[PDB]
Design an enzyme around this catalytic site. Structure first.
Site, PDB file in Angstrom:
ATOM      1  CD  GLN A 199      28.049 -24.696 -50.381  1.00 25.66           C
ATOM      2  OE1 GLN A 199      27.163 -24.586 -49.572  1.00 25.66           O
ATOM      3  NE2 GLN A 199      28.563 -25.240 -51.112  1.00 25.66           N
ATOM      4  CB  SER A 200      25.130 -17.541 -50.242  1.00 21.89           C
ATOM      5  OG  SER A 200      24.148 -16.520 -49.968  1.00 21.89           O
ATOM      6  CG  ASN A 201      23.324 -20.312 -44.971  1.00 24.30           C
ATOM      7  OD1 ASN A 201      23.270 -21.379 -45.214  1.00 24.30           O
ATOM      8  ND2 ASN A 201      24.000 -19.703 -43.894  1.00 24.30           N
TER       9      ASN A 201
END
Lengths: 323, 330
Positions: free
Chosen positions: A72-74
């Site tokens: 879930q890396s921005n």
């Protein structure tokens, strides 16, 4: 200031707003820097970085961007978008850092968008040594027929953090005659955002106290990484940086990517009270800190506090039911 | 001489949007489709992920406050963009928000039921009430309003999608930005926008008849057929024009081919458009509104449906969050 080519992704300066309801509830002047409001794929702090990074990647004549981070890396989301927008390929190295099996973490939120952006995705057990694992990958691609460009974890390199140095420019101007600012709070992760601020804000608003809330590491492990970038940034900017870096570790609870009640309470608070969406991995915890900060008279004085909304909202739909 | 609107300023509007939203050229898509294509980015809005619905609320909530209301009531699909935005504005302002929701596609899929927009509603502390269908909204809303009224409260009712005469003022004023942005900058030929609860389309049709009379305005229906939709748009056009002290004689244009199974059900054609715009331009459309509209815009060029070859402006009305709600399927 300038000699570093930046790309135009953000357009006009992001709004700085007063948070009357929250202020009145907490009993303190609280302002918000809205770096989540950005034209590119739901926006975030990471973009200001990519403005310099990808600008450079293009100078190198790269046709591919490689980077790494959580599922879930921005950063990966934003990187992958910029990629698609520009017509570069994007290879992403991802790790499941919380060891969850929950559907929504694995496929939903940010991760979902990556597929829409046609990101080439590779999995690994852990990012034990990123820079090496990235370089390993780069060279394999260098072979497959692609001329890459590597972007560090979170885009936090000397150059990347230039975005948040330039950010301080906006911030101080916006506050000119308009607010007597006393403190600034921002999440401290891969470090570049915190660092860029610290250099810019030492030079532009030297009286302002700058607090970073750690989202992954303790004060012990974090402080050196921040100081390193501070110095490197300052180095390349031809300036000197003598400002002490401040950090509070109490708020990341179980660890990076795991949500705490304290942080989660901050999300519900800001949504319900001000209609702003924080997120459970970064901004929420940072905000939880800001709140407990006032609670424990931890800031230098009583005055105005500026919270840097670094985005991250999409993670909400990924973290949805739990774990 | 953005003047014939002038009379168009007796309506108090709140400030939610700030600076005019960006109008952008879409070079890659353009080059791919073989047509000049521009995008009006009404999805980029400071308030809870933004959308077209907000420009409406700017007038609606302003009025709600004049009435001294302390509560906003409204209705829509579970994954309604309008309810999300309404509930946000509510919380920001300190009004309560009661929402009447229907499951309009009859799905049981977790993510539709709890995720996406619906999730945010809980964060915004929205009072939520379920019903089997919104067979007659205005009545079902008033039924609800009066029950709230008699628990000793002050409720303001916002129609479905915020599409009332007043609401659609937002998109009349939107036309102003649009024409001003295109001044000397683009020779605009067509404008495409999703046509649902109608207000957005309607507001444009009045503003654009008076500001850019040569521009062809296409609406892609997302729920109803040309037959059932056209009257609803024409009604608002006339009511809007009425209250703005203007006359409106422009024909309203609608294409029904693109909503496939019906409101809130995703078609291949539409989703193909979502993947296309994300991968090709890094913009996120949505499977209920913008995607279908865009799918229409694409097939439009394909069938030479527009008046001439020239530039097309696509009105990005938002809806992105619905993506995480529609996630694996249904």
């Amino acid at each position: 200031l300038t000699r570093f080519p930046r790309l135009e992704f953000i357009g006009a300066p992001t709004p700085l707003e007063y948070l009357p309801r929250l202020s009145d509830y907490l009993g303190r002047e609280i302002y918000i820097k809205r770096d989540d409001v950005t034209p590119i794929a739901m926006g975030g702090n990471k973009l200001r970085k990519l403005e310099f990074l990808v600008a450079d990647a293009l100078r190198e004549g790269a046709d591919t961007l490689i980077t790494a981070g959580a599922i879930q890396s921005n950063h990966v989301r934003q990187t992958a978008a910029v990629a698609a927008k520009l017509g570069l390929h994007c290879v992403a190295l991802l790790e499941n850092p919380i060891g969850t099996t929950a559907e929504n973490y694995l496929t939903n939120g940010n991760r979902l968008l990556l597929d829409l952006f046609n990101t080439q995705i590779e999995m690994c057990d852990a990012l034990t040594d990123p820079d090496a694992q990235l370089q390993t990958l780069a060279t394999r691609i260098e072979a497959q027929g692609f001329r890459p460009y590597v972007i560090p974890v979170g885009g936090s390199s000397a150059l990347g953090a230039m975005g948040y140095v330039e950010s301080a420019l906006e911030i101080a101007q916006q506050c000119e005659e308009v607010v007597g600012l006393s403190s600034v709070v921002v999440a401290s992760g891969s470090a570049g955002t915190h660092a860029g601020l610290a250099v810019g804000l030492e030079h532009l608003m030297p009286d302002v106290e700058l607090i970073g809330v750690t989202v992954s590491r303790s004060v012990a492990e974090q402080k050196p990484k921040v100081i390193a970038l501070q110095q490197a940034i300052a180095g390349q900017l031809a300036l000197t940086a003598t400002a002490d870096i401040h950090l509070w570790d109490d708020y990341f609870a179980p660890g990076y990517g795991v949500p705490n009640d304290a942080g989660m309470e901050a999300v519900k608070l800001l949504a319900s009270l001000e209609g702003v969406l924080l997120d459970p991995v970064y901004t929420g915890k940072a905000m939880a800190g800001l709140i407990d900060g006032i609670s424990q008279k931890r800031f230098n004085d009583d005055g105005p506090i500026l919270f840097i909304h670094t985005g991250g909202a999409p993670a909400l739909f990924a973290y949805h039911p739990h774990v």
